[PDB]
Amino acid sequence: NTVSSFQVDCFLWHVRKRFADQELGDAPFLDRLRADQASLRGRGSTLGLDIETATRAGKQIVERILEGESDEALKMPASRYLTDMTLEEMSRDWFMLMPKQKVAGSLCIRMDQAIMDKNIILKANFSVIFDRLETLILLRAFTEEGAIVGEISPLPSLPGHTDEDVKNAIGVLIGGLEWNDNTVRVSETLQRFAW
Amino acid sequence: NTVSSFQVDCFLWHVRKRFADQELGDAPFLDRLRADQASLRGRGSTLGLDIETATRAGKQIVERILEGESDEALKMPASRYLTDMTLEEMSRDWFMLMPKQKVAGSLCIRMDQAIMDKNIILKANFSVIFDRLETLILLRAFTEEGAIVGEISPLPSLPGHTDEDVKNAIGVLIGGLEWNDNTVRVSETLQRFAW
């Protein structure tokens, strides 16, 4: 119930206190330390439980979360994060004059039917693993003139998407753009990891 | 003198006429064809030379320029053009609040001393050959917030620059930026071809 979360609190306080004992903690850090020895004393008093049995039981619950870390904290490989786009580029507002939107396997594909006879380049920020595209943060289509005209975005409310899903979304976006005579080009950091 | 350039004119006219004979030429193309049969007739008249001997001698001068092409038109390898930056990005105006400029082997290096505690990424548009950076069109430093703060540009009035020159310029730019506690990151298309 509440007692268990309060054992968690008492133990975690004792933990950051052992931290602070090296005296590397920040002034606000230690302020929170005081604030929390206060709050925990007030709760242990207007509750009715000693805080040492609570510290022991919070040690027990960190042993359970440590059994969770012992189930295999860390997977077996490492990831790499690749960026074509400044944050600005990722978050810059844009619009399409005649939208074309589509959903395909946890991926939103947007483009503007009104873009014709432009050179478009595709930039993406994503994640690789085993030299293969692990997960897509975002992709965007820019005109050499500088305009955003298409976007491949991850759908949050779905259980993940794959590298083949992204190569398919890219191919479909490029097809839609090329239909209107737009010469579409891919940033090297996508050639090298998603074709 | 003038007669030789006019042999060049008469021959090159006969050439584009042989083109036009397939009737694939544009309306303005053929307009220029007429305009030029006119101008060449007027010049051959108020000059005093037949245009057929001039066509023969222009064939001789294209044989000399063809001996120039026979000295070895085409080198021995092929190049590739790599783009991080839309034209906009390359030509977008910027400024530095406290400039730092420098010349190093046909390369201009600019940066802003006033940039501190930013994440900067380096994008470049350049040319490779044998999977090595042949020649740099331009490089620019952007902040994740979107601001240009440094630039590595080719100096036109000098006899070319090398890939080592560019790796040195990059290293120097990154050093200058990192001095002010800015975390500098390189676009993958530079990692993969210029380190």
Coordinates of C-alpha atoms in Angstrom, one line a residue:
Chain A
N1 CA 0.0 0.0 0.0
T2 CA 1.3 3.3 1.2
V3 CA 3.8 1.8 3.7
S4 CA 5.7 0.1 0.8
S5 CA 6.1 3.3 -1.2
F6 CA 7.2 4.9 2.1
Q7 CA 9.8 2.2 2.6
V8 CA 11.0 3.1 -0.9
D9 CA 11.1 6.8 0.1
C10 CA 13.1 6.1 3.3
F11 CA 15.6 3.9 1.6
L12 CA 16.1 6.2 -1.4
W13 CA 16.6 9.1 1.1
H14 CA 19.3 7.1 2.9
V15 CA 20.9 6.5 -0.5
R16 CA 21.1 10.1 -1.6
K17 CA 22.3 10.9 1.9
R18 CA 25.2 8.4 1.5
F19 CA 25.8 10.3 -1.7
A20 CA 25.9 13.7 0.0
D21 CA 28.3 12.3 2.6
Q22 CA 31.0 12.8 -0.1
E23 CA 29.9 16.5 0.0
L24 CA 29.7 16.7 -3.8
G25 CA 26.0 17.5 -3.7
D26 CA 24.5 20.7 -4.8
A27 CA 23.0 23.3 -2.6
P28 CA 19.5 22.6 -3.8
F29 CA 20.2 18.9 -3.7
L30 CA 21.0 19.2 0.1
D31 CA 18.0 21.6 0.4
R32 CA 15.8 18.7 -0.9
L33 CA 17.6 16.4 1.5
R34 CA 16.5 18.5 4.4
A35 CA 13.0 19.1 3.0
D36 CA 12.7 15.3 2.7
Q37 CA 14.1 14.3 6.1
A38 CA 11.4 16.7 7.3
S39 CA 8.6 15.4 5.2
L40 CA 9.6 11.8 6.0
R41 CA 9.7 12.5 9.7
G42 CA 6.3 14.2 9.6
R43 CA 4.8 11.2 7.7
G44 CA 6.4 8.6 10.0
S45 CA 5.0 10.6 12.9
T46 CA 1.4 11.3 11.8
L47 CA 1.5 7.7 10.4
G48 CA 2.8 5.5 13.2
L49 CA 5.8 3.6 11.8
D50 CA 9.5 3.7 12.7
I51 CA 11.7 4.8 9.8
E52 CA 14.4 2.2 10.3
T53 CA 12.1 -0.8 9.7
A54 CA 10.9 1.2 6.7
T55 CA 14.5 1.7 5.5
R56 CA 15.0 -2.1 5.8
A57 CA 11.9 -2.8 3.9
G58 CA 12.8 -0.3 1.2
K59 CA 16.1 -2.1 1.0
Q60 CA 14.0 -5.2 0.4
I61 CA 12.1 -3.5 -2.4
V62 CA 15.3 -2.2 -4.0
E63 CA 16.4 -5.8 -3.8
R64 CA 13.3 -6.7 -5.9
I65 CA 13.9 -3.9 -8.4
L66 CA 17.6 -5.1 -8.4
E67 CA 16.3 -8.6 -9.2
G68 CA 14.6 -6.8 -12.0
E69 CA 17.9 -5.4 -13.1
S70 CA 19.3 -8.9 -12.5
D71 CA 16.8 -10.3 -15.0
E72 CA 19.3 -8.7 -17.5
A73 CA 19.9 -4.9 -17.2
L74 CA 21.3 -3.9 -20.7
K75 CA 20.4 -5.9 -23.9
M76 CA 23.3 -7.2 -25.9
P77 CA 24.1 -4.6 -28.5
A78 CA 24.8 -0.9 -28.7
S79 CA 23.0 1.9 -30.6
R80 CA 24.1 5.0 -32.5
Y81 CA 22.2 8.2 -33.0
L82 CA 22.4 9.9 -36.4
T83 CA 21.3 13.5 -37.1
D84 CA 20.7 15.2 -40.5
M85 CA 18.6 17.9 -39.0
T86 CA 19.1 20.6 -36.3
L87 CA 16.3 20.7 -33.7
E88 CA 15.1 23.8 -35.6
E89 CA 14.7 21.7 -38.8
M90 CA 12.8 19.1 -36.8
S91 CA 10.4 21.5 -35.1
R92 CA 10.1 24.2 -37.7
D93 CA 6.5 24.8 -38.6
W94 CA 5.4 24.1 -42.2
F95 CA 2.3 23.6 -44.2
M96 CA 1.2 21.9 -47.4
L97 CA -1.0 23.7 -49.9
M98 CA -2.8 20.4 -51.0
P99 CA -2.0 17.7 -48.4
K100 CA -1.5 14.0 -49.0
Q101 CA -1.5 12.1 -45.7
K102 CA -1.2 8.4 -45.1
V103 CA -0.7 5.9 -42.3
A104 CA 1.6 2.9 -42.9
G105 CA 2.7 0.6 -40.0
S106 CA 3.2 3.2 -37.2
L107 CA 4.4 5.8 -39.6
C108 CA 2.7 9.0 -40.7
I109 CA 3.6 10.0 -44.3
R110 CA 2.8 13.6 -45.3
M111 CA 3.5 15.3 -48.6
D112 CA 2.3 18.3 -50.7
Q113 CA 0.7 17.5 -54.1
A114 CA 1.3 21.1 -55.1
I115 CA 5.1 20.7 -55.3
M116 CA 6.2 20.4 -58.9
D117 CA 9.6 20.6 -60.7
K118 CA 11.7 21.1 -57.6
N119 CA 14.8 19.4 -56.4
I120 CA 14.0 17.8 -53.0
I121 CA 16.4 16.3 -50.5
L122 CA 15.4 14.0 -47.7
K123 CA 17.0 14.5 -44.3
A124 CA 16.3 12.2 -41.3
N125 CA 17.3 12.0 -37.7
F126 CA 17.2 8.3 -36.5
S127 CA 18.9 5.5 -34.5
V128 CA 20.9 2.6 -35.9
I129 CA 22.1 -0.8 -34.4
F130 CA 24.2 -3.4 -36.1
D131 CA 24.7 -0.8 -38.9
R132 CA 21.0 -1.0 -39.6
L133 CA 18.3 1.6 -39.0
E134 CA 16.9 0.8 -35.5
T135 CA 14.2 3.5 -35.1
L136 CA 13.3 6.8 -36.9
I137 CA 13.1 10.0 -34.8
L138 CA 11.8 12.0 -37.9
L139 CA 12.4 12.5 -41.6
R140 CA 11.7 15.7 -43.7
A141 CA 11.8 16.7 -47.3
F142 CA 13.3 20.1 -48.1
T143 CA 13.5 21.9 -51.4
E144 CA 16.9 23.3 -52.5
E145 CA 15.0 26.6 -52.1
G146 CA 14.6 25.7 -48.5
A147 CA 10.9 24.6 -48.1
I148 CA 9.6 21.6 -46.2
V149 CA 7.2 19.7 -48.4
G150 CA 7.0 16.2 -46.9
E151 CA 7.4 14.4 -43.6
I152 CA 7.8 10.8 -42.4
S153 CA 7.0 10.8 -38.7
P154 CA 6.8 8.0 -36.1
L155 CA 3.4 7.2 -34.7
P156 CA 3.7 7.2 -30.9
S157 CA 0.5 5.2 -30.1
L158 CA 1.7 2.0 -31.7
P159 CA 4.1 -0.8 -30.7
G160 CA 7.2 0.2 -32.7
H161 CA 8.1 0.2 -36.4
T162 CA 10.9 -1.5 -38.4
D163 CA 13.6 -0.6 -40.8
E164 CA 11.8 -2.2 -43.7
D165 CA 8.8 -0.1 -42.7
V166 CA 10.9 3.0 -43.1
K167 CA 12.5 2.0 -46.4
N168 CA 9.0 1.4 -47.7
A169 CA 7.7 4.8 -46.4
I170 CA 10.7 6.5 -48.0
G171 CA 10.1 4.7 -51.3
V172 CA 6.5 5.7 -51.2
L173 CA 7.3 9.4 -50.4
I174 CA 9.8 9.5 -53.2
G175 CA 7.3 8.0 -55.6
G176 CA 4.6 10.5 -54.7
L177 CA 7.1 13.4 -55.1
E178 CA 8.6 12.1 -58.3
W179 CA 5.1 11.8 -59.9
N180 CA 4.9 15.6 -60.1
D181 CA 8.4 15.8 -61.9
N182 CA 10.4 16.6 -58.7
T183 CA 13.9 15.2 -58.6
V184 CA 14.3 13.7 -55.1
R185 CA 17.7 13.0 -53.5
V186 CA 18.6 11.3 -50.3
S187 CA 21.1 12.6 -47.7
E188 CA 24.1 10.3 -47.5
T189 CA 23.3 9.3 -43.9
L190 CA 20.2 7.5 -45.2
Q191 CA 21.8 6.0 -48.2
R192 CA 24.4 4.5 -45.8
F193 CA 21.7 3.1 -43.4
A194 CA 18.3 2.7 -45.0
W195 CA 18.6 2.8 -48.8
Chain B
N1 CA 42.9 37.0 -86.5
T2 CA 39.2 37.6 -87.2
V3 CA 39.1 35.3 -90.2
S4 CA 40.0 32.3 -88.0
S5 CA 37.2 33.0 -85.4
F6 CA 34.8 33.5 -88.4
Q7 CA 35.8 30.1 -89.8
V8 CA 34.9 28.8 -86.3
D9 CA 31.6 30.6 -86.6
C10 CA 30.8 29.3 -90.1
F11 CA 31.7 25.7 -89.1
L12 CA 29.8 25.8 -85.8
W13 CA 26.7 27.1 -87.7
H14 CA 26.9 24.3 -90.2
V15 CA 27.1 22.0 -87.2
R16 CA 24.0 23.2 -85.5
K17 CA 22.3 23.2 -88.9
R18 CA 23.0 19.5 -89.3
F19 CA 21.5 19.2 -85.8
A20 CA 18.4 21.1 -86.9
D21 CA 18.0 18.9 -89.9
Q22 CA 16.6 16.2 -87.6
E23 CA 14.0 19.0 -86.7
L24 CA 14.3 18.4 -83.0
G25 CA 15.5 22.0 -82.5
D26 CA 13.5 24.6 -80.6
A27 CA 11.7 27.6 -82.1
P28 CA 14.3 30.0 -80.6
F29 CA 17.1 27.6 -81.6
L30 CA 16.0 27.9 -85.2
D31 CA 15.4 31.7 -84.8
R32 CA 19.1 32.0 -83.8
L33 CA 19.9 29.8 -86.8
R34 CA 18.3 32.3 -89.1
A35 CA 19.7 35.3 -87.2
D36 CA 23.1 33.8 -87.6
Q37 CA 22.9 32.8 -91.2
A38 CA 22.0 36.4 -91.6
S39 CA 24.8 37.8 -89.5
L40 CA 27.4 35.5 -91.1
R41 CA 26.2 36.4 -94.6
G42 CA 26.5 40.1 -93.7
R43 CA 30.0 39.6 -92.3
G44 CA 31.2 37.5 -95.3
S45 CA 29.9 40.2 -97.6
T46 CA 31.1 43.4 -95.9
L47 CA 34.3 41.4 -95.3
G48 CA 35.2 39.8 -98.6
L49 CA 35.6 36.1 -97.9
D50 CA 33.5 33.1 -99.3
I51 CA 31.9 31.2 -96.5
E52 CA 32.8 27.7 -97.9
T53 CA 36.5 28.1 -97.6
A54 CA 35.7 29.6 -94.1
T55 CA 33.7 26.4 -93.3
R56 CA 36.6 24.2 -94.4
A57 CA 39.1 26.2 -92.3
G58 CA 36.7 26.1 -89.3
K59 CA 36.6 22.3 -89.8
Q60 CA 40.4 22.5 -89.6
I61 CA 40.2 24.5 -86.3
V62 CA 37.8 22.0 -84.9
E63 CA 40.3 19.4 -85.9
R64 CA 42.8 21.3 -83.7
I65 CA 40.4 21.5 -80.8
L66 CA 39.7 17.8 -81.5
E67 CA 43.4 17.1 -81.3
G68 CA 43.0 18.9 -77.9
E69 CA 40.3 16.4 -77.0
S70 CA 42.5 13.7 -78.4
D71 CA 45.3 14.7 -76.0
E72 CA 42.9 12.9 -73.5
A73 CA 39.4 14.1 -73.1
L74 CA 38.2 12.7 -69.7
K75 CA 40.7 11.9 -66.9
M76 CA 40.7 8.4 -65.5
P77 CA 38.3 8.4 -62.5
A78 CA 34.8 9.5 -61.7
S79 CA 33.6 12.0 -59.1
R80 CA 30.5 12.0 -56.8
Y81 CA 28.7 15.1 -55.4
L82 CA 27.6 15.0 -51.7
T83 CA 25.2 17.5 -50.2
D84 CA 24.4 18.2 -46.6
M85 CA 22.9 21.6 -47.2
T86 CA 20.0 22.9 -49.3
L87 CA 21.0 25.8 -51.5
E88 CA 19.2 28.0 -49.0
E89 CA 21.5 26.8 -46.2
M90 CA 24.5 27.5 -48.4
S91 CA 23.4 31.0 -49.3
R92 CA 21.5 32.1 -46.2
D93 CA 22.9 35.3 -44.8
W94 CA 24.4 35.2 -41.3
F95 CA 26.7 37.2 -39.1
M96 CA 29.1 36.7 -36.2
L97 CA 28.9 39.0 -33.1
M98 CA 32.7 38.7 -32.6
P99 CA 34.3 37.4 -35.7
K100 CA 37.3 35.1 -35.9
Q101 CA 38.6 34.8 -39.5
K102 CA 41.6 33.0 -40.9
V103 CA 43.1 31.9 -44.2
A104 CA 44.7 28.4 -44.5
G105 CA 45.7 26.9 -47.8
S106 CA 43.0 28.3 -50.1
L107 CA 40.4 28.0 -47.3
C108 CA 38.6 30.7 -45.4
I109 CA 37.7 29.7 -41.9
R110 CA 35.2 31.9 -40.0
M111 CA 33.7 31.4 -36.6
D112 CA 32.0 33.4 -33.8
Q113 CA 33.9 33.8 -30.6
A114 CA 30.6 34.7 -28.9
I115 CA 29.0 31.2 -29.2
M116 CA 29.2 29.4 -25.9
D117 CA 27.5 26.3 -24.5
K118 CA 25.8 25.2 -27.7
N119 CA 25.5 22.0 -29.6
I120 CA 26.9 22.7 -33.1
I121 CA 26.7 20.4 -36.1
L122 CA 28.9 20.8 -39.2
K123 CA 27.3 20.3 -42.6
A124 CA 29.2 20.4 -45.8
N125 CA 28.5 20.1 -49.6
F126 CA 31.5 18.8 -51.4
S127 CA 32.9 16.4 -54.1
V128 CA 34.6 13.0 -53.6
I129 CA 36.7 10.8 -55.8
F130 CA 38.2 7.3 -54.9
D131 CA 36.0 7.6 -51.8
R132 CA 38.1 10.6 -50.7
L133 CA 37.1 14.2 -50.5
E134 CA 38.1 15.8 -53.8
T135 CA 37.0 19.4 -53.4
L136 CA 34.9 21.4 -50.9
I137 CA 31.9 23.4 -52.2
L138 CA 31.2 24.8 -48.7
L139 CA 30.9 23.9 -45.0
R140 CA 28.8 25.6 -42.3
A141 CA 28.3 25.2 -38.5
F142 CA 24.7 25.3 -37.3
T143 CA 23.4 25.3 -33.7
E144 CA 20.6 22.8 -32.8
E145 CA 18.7 26.1 -32.3
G146 CA 19.3 26.7 -36.0
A147 CA 21.9 29.5 -36.1
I148 CA 25.0 29.6 -38.4
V149 CA 28.1 30.4 -36.4
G150 CA 31.1 29.1 -38.5
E151 CA 32.0 28.6 -42.1
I152 CA 34.7 26.9 -44.1
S153 CA 34.7 28.2 -47.6
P154 CA 36.9 27.7 -50.7
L155 CA 39.1 30.6 -51.8
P156 CA 38.6 31.0 -55.5
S157 CA 41.7 33.0 -56.2
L158 CA 44.2 30.2 -55.5
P159 CA 45.2 26.9 -57.3
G160 CA 43.1 24.4 -55.5
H161 CA 43.0 22.8 -52.0
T162 CA 43.4 19.3 -50.8
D163 CA 41.5 16.8 -48.6
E164 CA 44.1 17.1 -45.8
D165 CA 43.7 20.9 -46.0
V166 CA 40.0 20.4 -45.3
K167 CA 40.5 17.9 -42.5
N168 CA 42.9 20.4 -41.0
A169 CA 40.4 23.3 -41.4
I170 CA 37.7 21.2 -39.8
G171 CA 39.9 20.2 -36.9
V172 CA 40.8 23.9 -36.3
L173 CA 37.2 25.1 -36.5
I174 CA 36.1 22.3 -34.1
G175 CA 38.9 23.3 -31.7
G176 CA 38.0 27.0 -31.7
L177 CA 34.4 26.2 -31.1
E178 CA 35.1 23.6 -28.4
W179 CA 37.3 26.2 -26.5
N180 CA 34.1 28.0 -25.5
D181 CA 32.4 24.8 -24.2
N182 CA 30.4 24.1 -27.4
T183 CA 29.8 20.4 -28.1
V184 CA 30.6 20.1 -31.9
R185 CA 29.2 17.2 -34.0
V186 CA 29.9 16.2 -37.6
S187 CA 27.3 15.2 -40.1
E188 CA 27.7 11.5 -41.1
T189 CA 28.6 12.5 -44.7
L190 CA 31.8 14.1 -43.4
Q191 CA 32.7 11.3 -41.0
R192 CA 32.4 8.9 -43.9
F193 CA 34.6 11.0 -46.2
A194 CA 36.8 13.5 -44.4
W195 CA 37.1 12.5 -40.7

